[PDB]
Design a protein around this ligand. Structure first.
Ligand SMILES: *[C@@H]1O[C@H](CO)[C@@H](O[C@@H]2O[C@H](CO)[C@@H](O[C@@H]3O[C@H](CO[C@H]4O[C@H](CO)[C@@H](O)[C@H](O[C@H]5O[C@H](CO)[C@@H](O)[C@H](O)[C@@H]5O)[C@@H]4O)[C@@H](O)[C@H](O[C@H]4O[C@H](CO)[C@@H](O)[C@H](O)[C@@H]4O[C@H]4O[C@H](CO)[C@@H](O)[C@H](O)[C@@H]4O)[C@@H]3O)[C@H](O)[C@H]2NC(C)=O)[C@H](O)[C@H]1NC(C)=O
Ligand SMILES: *[C@@H]1O[C@H](CO)[C@@H](O[C@@H]2O[C@H](CO)[C@@H](O[C@@H]3O[C@H](CO)[C@@H](O)[C@H](O)[C@@H]3O)[C@H](O)[C@H]2NC(C)=O)[C@H](O)[C@H]1NC(C)=O
Ligand SMILES: *[C@@H]1O[C@H](CO)[C@@H](O[C@@H]2O[C@H](CO)[C@@H](O[C@@H]3O[C@H](CO)[C@@H](O)[C@H](O)[C@@H]3O)[C@H](O)[C@H]2NC(C)=O)[C@H](O)[C@H]1NC(C)=O
Ligand SMILES: *[C@@H]1O[C@H](CO)[C@@H](O[C@@H]2O[C@H](CO)[C@@H](O)[C@H](O)[C@H]2NC(C)=O)[C@H](O)[C@H]1NC(C)=O
Ligand SMILES: *[C@@H]1O[C@H](CO)[C@@H](O[C@@H]2O[C@H](CO)[C@@H](O)[C@H](O)[C@H]2NC(C)=O)[C@H](O)[C@H]1NC(C)=O
Ligand SMILES: *[C@@H]1O[C@H](CO)[C@@H](O[C@@H]2O[C@H](CO)[C@@H](O)[C@H](O)[C@H]2NC(C)=O)[C@H](O)[C@H]1NC(C)=O
Ligand SMILES: *[C@@H]1O[C@H](CO)[C@@H](O[C@@H]2O[C@H](CO)[C@@H](O)[C@H](O)[C@H]2NC(C)=O)[C@H](O)[C@H]1NC(C)=O
Ligand SMILES: *[C@@H]1O[C@H](CO)[C@@H](O[C@@H]2O[C@H](CO)[C@@H](O)[C@H](O)[C@H]2NC(C)=O)[C@H](O)[C@H]1NC(C)=O
Ligand SMILES: *[C@@H]1O[C@H](CO)[C@@H](O)[C@H](O)[C@H]1NC(C)=O
Ligand SMILES: *[C@@H]1O[C@H](CO)[C@@H](O)[C@H](O)[C@H]1NC(C)=O
Ligand SMILES: *[C@@H]1O[C@H](CO)[C@@H](O)[C@H](O)[C@H]1NC(C)=O
Ligand SMILES: *[C@@H]1O[C@H](CO)[C@@H](O)[C@H](O)[C@H]1NC(C)=O
Ligand SMILES: *[C@@H]1O[C@H](CO)[C@@H](O)[C@H](O)[C@H]1NC(C)=O
Ligand SMILES: *[C@@H]1O[C@H](CO)[C@@H](O)[C@H](O)[C@H]1NC(C)=O
Ligand SMILES: *[C@@H]1O[C@H](CO)[C@@H](O)[C@H](O)[C@H]1NC(C)=O
Ligand SMILES: *[C@@H]1O[C@H](CO)[C@@H](O)[C@H](O)[C@H]1NC(C)=O
Ligand SMILES: *[C@@H]1O[C@H](CO)[C@@H](O)[C@H](O)[C@H]1NC(C)=O
Ligand SMILES: *[C@@H]1O[C@H](CO)[C@@H](O)[C@H](O)[C@H]1NC(C)=O
Ligand SMILES: *[C@@H]1O[C@H](CO)[C@@H](O)[C@H](O)[C@H]1NC(C)=O
Ligand SMILES: *[C@@H]1O[C@H](CO)[C@@H](O)[C@H](O)[C@H]1NC(C)=O
Ligand SMILES: *[C@@H]1O[C@H](CO)[C@@H](O)[C@H](O)[C@H]1NC(C)=O
Ligand SMILES: *[C@@H]1O[C@H](CO)[C@@H](O)[C@H](O)[C@H]1NC(C)=O
Ligand SMILES: *[C@@H]1O[C@H](CO)[C@@H](O)[C@H](O)[C@H]1NC(C)=O
Ligand SMILES: *[C@@H]1O[C@H](CO)[C@@H](O)[C@H](O)[C@H]1NC(C)=O
Ligand SMILES: *[C@@H]1O[C@H](CO)[C@@H](O)[C@H](O)[C@H]1NC(C)=O
Ligand SMILES: *[C@@H]1O[C@H](CO)[C@@H](O)[C@H](O)[C@H]1NC(C)=O
Lengths: 124, 442, 124, 124, 47, 48
C-alpha cells in the first residue's frame, strides 16, 4: 500500500527505493504578484534538475546506470552497511562535499566519450 | 562486482532548510479575505528526528509584513479627513457630577464646509479627554495628532472581527509539524508529520494578554530561550481558559454631515440614559487558582524556596502599560493593575477593572499617518478566553531571594510566535547520488 | 496534403492517427498582467502532461506501447467497430469514468516492475 | 581544458564539436515586472527548441542522426572543406534560406514513416 | 484571417450562457475609467 | 575624434581625452536655512 507523500522518509534506502514515483507526482501540483512570484519559482526548479538529468544521457529513466568508478577515498563503506541500516538523511552528509566533483566528471566525460562512438560506428 | 560504480536516483525523500513566500487559504468585507484561494489531508511520519527552532523562524517575519500592507490598502479609498483641524471652542459636558467619570466627555463646537464651498456650517459634538489638547469663558482645544500626521477616517461599513486564515505553501515545498505533547522552544522532536497547509490562525491584536487563542495539553507550559538571561520575554500557555466579560453600558446616537462633494463624515452624538464607565469583570477564584498553578511550574528553575512576587507595569506609553484590545469595533485601554498583586511563599464574587476608551489611534508606530474610528450605536458586549500571558523579570544583586515579575510585552511579533511555533518551512530536492554494482551497456 | 490544425476532427481514428504532429506543433505558439497571466498558464498545462507522459516510460515516442491488459469489462467493442467508424469525440465518453483507474495502474505498476529487472540483470 | 562559455566560437567545426555541453549548461542560469518579463522570456525560448528537438525523434541525445538525403543543390561543398577550415558563423549564411524546407521534410516525413513500422512489427 | 474549415462534426452551441460576454463587459468599464485618471478633477465648481 | 560623417555638419562630434585636466568650482556664502509647517503633517524648507 502507498504510505503517502514522504512516507518512506525514515525507512531503509533499499525499502525507500521501492517507492519513488509518489515523491515525483506531487512535484508540479497587486496581490497577484505573490501568486505568480511563487508559481514561476516552482517551474525552473523543476526545469533545472530536469535539464541536468537530461545531459547525463538517461533523461527518460529513473534508475540510471553509468560507468564511472566510485573511488572509495570519498567514502569507505561496504555494500551491506549502506543498503540495510541508514537512511538517505544520514547519507546526505558524507556526500555533501564531493557533489560538484561528482556532477562534473560524470557529465563532462562520459556522454562526450559516448557520442564519439556511434559517430564512428554508423560511419561504417 | 567489487569495483563499485555510481548511479543517480530521481525522487528521493530528502530536504533542506530554505525560506520562500506563502499565500492565502480561507473559506460585508474584512481586512483580509477579499480575494484569495479557497481551501486537512495530513500524512503521518515516524522515527524521523528534526531540530525545530522557534524565535528564528522566517514565517513570522513574512506575515508581520503581510498584515501591515493588508491593513494599509484597506484604508486608502476612504475619506481623507484634512479640513477638520480647526480651532475648537469647547467646554466640559455633564457638569456638577460627583461620580468617577468627570474629566472625560468634553463638548466642543467647530465649523466645517458643506457641499457649497461658499457656505459654511455649525455643528455640536462630543469628544473624550485623551484626544483634545488645549493651546495657548471656554478654552481653545485642538486635536491630539494634527501637528505630525494627516489623519484619515475608516470606512464605516467594513469591520474588524478576526476571520481564521491558513498559510499555504507553493509546489516544491512542504510544512513540517511537531506532534509532541510537552515541548519547549528549541530541541529535537521525535514525532513529525507533513501537512500541506496549517490550521486556522486568528490574527487578534492585543497587548499584555492573549485572547481567543488555542489551548495546550494537560499541564501549563512556560517557554523562553534562556531564562537565566533577564532580557528576553517569557511565553506561558494555559490549559483551562478563564473568562472575562467586558462592556460599555451607555447608549449612543450618531449623526451625519457632508464635508464636501460626495464625501461623508460621522461623529459622536449625545448620551441618552446614564453616564457610566466601561469596565471588565473576571471570576476571582479561578484566576487565583491559575496563578497558583503557574507559580508551581515556575519553581523548577529557581530551587524550592525563593520568594516569588508579582507587580504592576513599569512605564512607557498607554499601548503597553495598560491592557488593550478591540471588542467589536471600539478600542479599549484597561488598567489591569488588580491582577498582579501579592507574593507567594512555600508554606463567588469578581474583580472589577477600570477601563478607558480612546478614538485617535496610531497602531504599528508609523510616523506620518493615523486613523479615526467612528462610534457605534447601541451597547457593546464581549466574552472571550484568556489563554497565555507575557511576563518579564527584573535584575537584582547577587544575594537575592525575591525575584519579581512584571507583565510586559508590547512588541506585536510575540502574538504570533505563540501560535505558529509548531511549523517549519522546508524545500524538497529530488536528486540524489549513491553507488551500487550496476554498469551500463555499450 | 496537410489539412491544417484540427483537420481530422471528424475523420476516423485510423485516419486521424496518420496525422498527429500538426496538433502538437501549434501547442506552444497594469494590462501586462493579462499578457502574463495567460502566458504562464500555457506553460504548466504543457508541463503537466509532459511530465505525466514521462513517468509512463515512453517520454520520447508518440505511439507508446505497454503491457497492461484491457479488461473488456470497461468497454466491450471489437477491433473493427472502433477503428473504422466512430471518431475520438465519441470515444471520449465511454472512457471518461475509467480514467483515474487507467492512469493509476499503468503508472504505479509497470515502470516500478520494469526497473527491478535491469537492476538485477546489470548486476550479473 | 574547458575554454569557457563560447570558447570555440572561432575554431573549426570539428574542434567545436568536441565541446558542446558548456554552451548548454549556461542556458537556463512596479519594477518587479521587468524581473519577470525577462525571467518568463527565457523559458519558452528554451521550451520551443526543446519541443522542436523532441518531435524529431531524438530528444534525448545531442548528436542525432536521421535518414534524409542532403541533395547538394542546396550547397555544394567537400566533406573536407566543411570540417577543416570554416567556422559555424560562415556556415550559417549558405543554409539560412533552406531552413524552413529542412525543418519541414525532416519533421513531417520521417517520424511519421517510423511509427507505421513498429505498429506493424509489434502486431506480429 | 487564416481560418480552417471543418467537416462532419456537430456541436451544441449555447448563447445567453456564453462566458465571453462576461469578461469583455468588465474589460470595457476598467478601460473606460482608466482614461479619466490623469484628467482634471472638477471639485471647486459646486458654487 | 568620433562622429558619424565628417562631411556632414548636421551630426555632432564626440572627442575623448587621455590626460584629464582638473576643474574647481565652489560657492562661498554661508546660507542659514529655516523651516515652516505648511499643512497637517507636511513641511516646507526655504532660504534664510
Ligand atoms: C473571541 O471570540 C468570541 C466568540 O464568541 C467573540 O465574541 C463575539 O464577537 C462578535 C464580534 O462580531 C460579537 O458579535 C456582535 O454581536 C452583536 C450582538 O448581536 C447578538 O444579539 C442580537 C440581538 O438581536 C442578535 O440578533 C444576534 O444574533 C445574530 O446571530 C444569530 C446567529 O445565531 C442569528 O440567528 C441572528 O438572527 C442574528 O443574525 C447576536 O446574538 C451584533 O449586534 C454585532 O453585529 C453588528 O455589527 C456587524 C458589523 O457592523 C453587523 O454586520 C451586524 O448586522 C450588526 O450591525 C450593527 O451595526 C450596524 C452598522 O450599520 C447597524 O446598522 C445595526 O443596526 C447593528 O447595530 C456583532 O455580530 C458577539 O456578540 C461576541 N459574543 C458571542 C457570544 O458571540 C469575541 O469578540 C472574540 N474576542 C476578540 C475578537 O477579541
Ligand atoms: C544561556 O546563557 C548561559 C549563560 O552564559 C549559557 O550557559 C553557559 O554555557 C557555557 C558554555 O560555553 C558554560 O561555560 C562553561 O563553564 C564551565 C564552568 O562552569 C567551564 O569549565 C567550561 O569550559 C565552559 O566555559 C557556562 O558555565 C554556562 N553558564 C552557566 C551559568 O551554567 C548558555 O550558553 C545559554 N543557554 C542555555 C543555558 O541553554
Ligand atoms: C558621408 O557622406 C558622403 C557624402 O558625399 C558619402 O560619400 C559619397 O559616397 C557615394 C557612394 O554612394 C559616392 O558616390 C560615388 O561617387 C563616385 C565619384 O563621384 C562615382 O564614380 C560613383 O559612381 C558614385 O556615384 C560619393 O562620391 C561620395 N562622396 C564623396 C564626397 O566622396 C559617404 O559615403 C558618407 N559616409 C558615411 C559613413 O555615411
Ligand atoms: C523505523 O520505523 C520502521 C517502520 O515503522 C521500523 O521498521 C521495522 O523494521 C524491522 C527491522 O529492523 C522489522 O522487523 C519490522 O517489522 C519493521 N516494522 C514495520 C514494518 O512496521 C523500524 O524499526 C524503525 N527504526 C528503528 C531503528 O527501530
Ligand atoms: C465659525 O466661524 C466664525 C468665523 O469667524 C467664527 O465666529 C464669528 O465671530 C464673529 C466675531 O466674533 C461674529 O461676528 C460671527 O457671528 C461669528 N460667526 C459664527 C458662525 O460663529 C466662529 O468661531 C466659528 N464657529 C465655531 C463653532 O467654531
Ligand atoms: C504637537 O502638539 C503636542 C500638543 O500640543 C505637543 O506636545 C506637548 O508639547 C509641549 C511643548 O512645550 C510639552 O510641554 C507638553 O508636555 C507636550 N504634551 C505631551 C507630551 O503630552 C507636541 O510637542 C507637538 N509636536 C510638535 C510641535 O512637533
Ligand atoms: C491603575 O490603578 C492604579 C491603582 O490605583 C493606579 O496607581 C496609582 O498611581 C498613582 C500615581 O501617582 C499613585 O499615587 C497611587 O498611589 C497609585 N494607587 C495605588 C493604590 O497605589 C494607576 O494610576 C492606574 N492607572 C495606570 C495607567 O496604571
Ligand atoms: C465526412 O463524412 C463523409 C460521409 O459521412 C465521409 O465519407 C467519405 O467520402 C469520401 C468521398 O466519397 C470517400 O472516399 C470515403 O470512403 C468516405 N468514407 C466513408 C467512411 O464512407 C468522410 O470520411 C468524412 N470526412 C471527410 C473529411 O470528408
Ligand atoms: C581517487 O582517489 C585518490 C585517493 O587519493 C585520489 O588521489 C584521486 O585523485 C581520485 N581520483 C581519481 C580519478 O583517481
Ligand atoms: C563491512 O565493511 C567492513 C569495512 O568497514 C568490512 O571489513 C566488512 O567485511 C564488511 N562486511 C560485513 C561486516 O559483512
Ligand atoms: C565537508 O566540508 C566542510 C567544510 O569545512 C567540513 O567542515 C566538513 O567536516 C566536511 N564533511 C565531510 C563529511 O567531509
Ligand atoms: C528543552 O528541553 C531539553 C530536554 O529536556 C533540554 O535539553 C533543553 O536544554 C531545553 N531548552 C530550554 C531552553 O529549556
Ligand atoms: C438606546 O437608544 C435608543 C434610541 O431610540 C432606544 O430605542 C433604546 O431603547 C435605548 N436603549 C438601549 C438599551 O438600546
Ligand atoms: C460573563 O458572561 C457570561 C455570558 O454567558 C455569563 O455566563 C457569566 O456568568 C458572566 N460572568 C462571569 C464571571 O463569567
Ligand atoms: C488564593 O488561593 C490560595 C489557594 O492556594 C488560597 O490559600 C488563598 O487564600 C487565595 N487568596 C489569596 C489572596 O492568596
Ligand atoms: C522542589 O520540591 C519538590 C517537592 O515535590 C521536589 O520534588 C523537587 O526536587 C524540588 N526541586 C528543587 C530544584 O529543589
Ligand atoms: C494589593 O491588595 C491590597 C489589599 O489591601 C491593596 O491594599 C494593595 O494596594 C494591592 N496592591 C496592588 C499592587 O495591587
Ligand atoms: C473558550 O474555550 C471553551 C473551551 O472549549 C469554548 O467552549 C469556548 O467557545 C471558547 N470561547 C471562544 C472560542 O470564544
Ligand atoms: C477486470 O474486470 C473484472 C470484471 O468484473 C473486475 O472484477 C476486475 O476488478 C477488473 N480488474 C482486474 C485487474 O481484474
Ligand atoms: C464485432 O463485435 C461483436 C460483439 O459486439 C462480435 O460478435 C463480432 O464478431 C465483431 N466483428 C465483426 C462484426 O466483424
Ligand atoms: C460515467 O459516470 C457518471 C456518473 O454518474 C454516469 O452518470 C455516466 O452514465 C457514466 N458513463 C459511462 C459511459 O459509464
Ligand atoms: C533536390 O532539389 C531539387 C531542386 O529543388 C528538387 O527538384 C529535387 O526533388 C530534390 N531531390 C531530393 C532527393 O530531395
Ligand atoms: C572537394 O570538392 C571539390 C569540388 O568542390 C572536388 O574537386 C574535390 O575533389 C573534393 N575533394 C577535395 C579536393 O577537397
Ligand atoms: C538568401 O535569400 C536572400 C533573399 O533575397 C538572398 O538575397 C540571398 O542572396 C540568399 N542567400 C543564399 C546563400 O542563398
Ligand atoms: C572608420 O575607420 C575605418 C578604418 O580606417 C575606415 O575604413 C572607415 O571609413 C572609418 N569610418 C569613419 C566614419 O570614419
Ligand atoms: C556660517 O554660520 C555658522 C552658524 O553658526 C557659523 O558657525 C560658521 O562659522 C559660519 N561660517 C562658515 C564658513 O561655515
Amino acid at each position: 500500500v502507498s504510505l503517502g507523500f514522504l512516507g518512506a522518509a525514515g525507512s531503509t534506502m533499499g525499502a525507500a527505493s521501492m517507492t519513488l514515483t509518489v515523491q515525483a507526482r506531487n512535484l508540479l501540483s497587486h496581490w497577484g504578484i505573490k501568486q505568480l512570484q511563487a508559481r514561476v519559482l516552482a517551474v525552473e526548479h523543476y526545469l533545472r534538475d530536469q535539464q541536468l538529468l537530461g545531459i547525463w544521457g538517461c533523461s527518460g529513466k529513473l534508475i540510471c546506470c553509468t560507468n564511472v568508478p566510485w573511488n572509495s577515498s570519498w567514502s569507505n563503506r561496504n555494500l551491506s552497511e549502506i543498503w540495510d541500516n541508514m537512511t538517505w538523511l544520514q547519507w546526505d552528509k558524507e556526500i555533501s562535499n564531493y557533489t560538484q566533483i561528482i556532477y562534473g566528471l560524470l557529465e563532462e566525460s562520459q556522454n562526450q566519450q559516448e557520442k564519439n562512438e556511434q559517430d564512428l560506428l554508423a560511419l561504417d | 562486482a567489487e569495483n563499485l560504480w555510481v548511479t543517480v536516483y530521481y525522487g528521493v525523500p530528502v530536504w533542506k532548510d530554505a525560506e520562500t513566500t506563502l499565500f492565502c487559504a480561507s473559506d460585508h468585507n474584512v481586512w483580509a479575505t477579499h480575494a484569495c484561494v479557497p481551501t486537512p489531508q495530513e500524512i503521518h511520519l515516524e522515527n524521523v528526528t528534526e531540530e525545530f527552532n522557534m524565535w528564528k523562524n522566517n514565517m513570522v517575519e513574512q506575515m508581520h509584513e503581510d498584515i501591515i500592507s493588508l491593513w494599509d490598502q484597506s484604508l486608502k479609498p476612504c475619506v481623507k479627513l484634512t479640513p477638520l483641524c480647526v480651532t475648537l471652542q469647547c467646554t466640559n459636558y455633564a457638569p456638577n457630577l460627583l461620580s468617577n467619570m468627570r474629566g472625560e466627555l468634553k463638548q466642543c463646537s467647530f465649523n466645517m464646509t458643506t457641499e457649497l464651498r461658499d457656505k459654511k456650517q455649525k455643528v455640536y459634538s462630543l469628544f473624550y479627554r485623551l484626544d483634545v489638547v488645549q493651546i495657548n469663558s471656554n478654552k481653545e482645544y485642538r486635536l491630539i495628532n494634527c501637528n505630525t500626521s494627516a489623519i484619515t477616517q475608516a470606512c464605516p461599513k467594513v469591520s474588524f472581527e478576526p476571520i481564521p486564515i491558513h498559510y499555504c505553501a507553493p509546489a516544491g515545498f512542504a510544512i513540517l509539524k511537531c506532534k509532541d505533547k510537552k515541548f519547549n522552544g528549541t530541541g529535537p522532536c521525535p514525532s513529525v508529520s507533513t501537512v500541506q497547509c496549517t490550521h486556522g490562525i486568528k490574527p487578534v491584536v492585543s497587548t499584555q494578554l492573549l485572547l481567543n487563542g488555542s489551548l495546550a495539553e494537560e499541564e501549563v507550559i512556560i517557554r523562553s530561550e534562556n531564562i537565566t538571561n533577564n532580557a528576553k520575554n517569557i511565553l506561558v500557555q494555559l490549559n483551562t481558559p478563564v473568562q472575562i466579560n467586558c462592556t460599555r453600558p451607555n447608549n449612543n446616537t450618531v449623526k451625519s454631515i457632508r464635508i464636501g462633494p460626495g464625501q461623508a463624515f460621522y461623529y459622536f452624538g449625545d448620551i441618552i440614559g446614564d453616564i457610566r464607565m466601561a469596565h471588565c469583570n473576571v471570576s476571582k477564584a479561578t484566576w487565583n487558582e491559575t496563578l497558583g498553578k503557574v507559580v508551581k511550574q515556575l519553581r523548577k528553575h529557581f530551587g524550592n524556596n525563593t520568594i516569588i512576587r508579582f507587580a504592576q507595569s513599569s512605564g512607557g506609553d498607554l499601548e503597553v502599560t495598560t491592557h488593550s484590545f478591540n471588542c467589536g469595533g471600539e478600542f479599549f485601554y484597561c488598567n489591569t493593575s488588580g491582577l498582579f498583586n501579592s507574593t507567594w511563599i512555600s508554606n463567588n464574587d469578581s474583580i472589577v477593572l477600570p477601563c478607558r476608551i480612546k478614538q485617535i489611534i496610531n497602531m504599528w508606530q508609523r510616523i506620518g499617518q493615523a486613523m479615526y474610528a467612528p462610534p457605534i450605536q447601541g451597547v457593546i458586549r464581549c466574552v472571550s478566553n484568556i489563554t497565555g500571558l507575557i511576563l518579564t523579570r527584573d535584575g537584582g544583586s547577587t544575594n537575592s531571594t525575591t525575584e519579581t515579575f512584571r507583565p510586559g510585552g508590547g512588541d506585536m511579533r510575540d502574538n504570533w510566535r505563540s501560535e505558529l511555533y509548531k511549523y517549519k518551512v522546508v524545500k524538497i530536492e529530488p536528486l540524489g547520488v549513491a553507488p551500487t554494482r550496476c554498469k551500463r551497456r555499450v
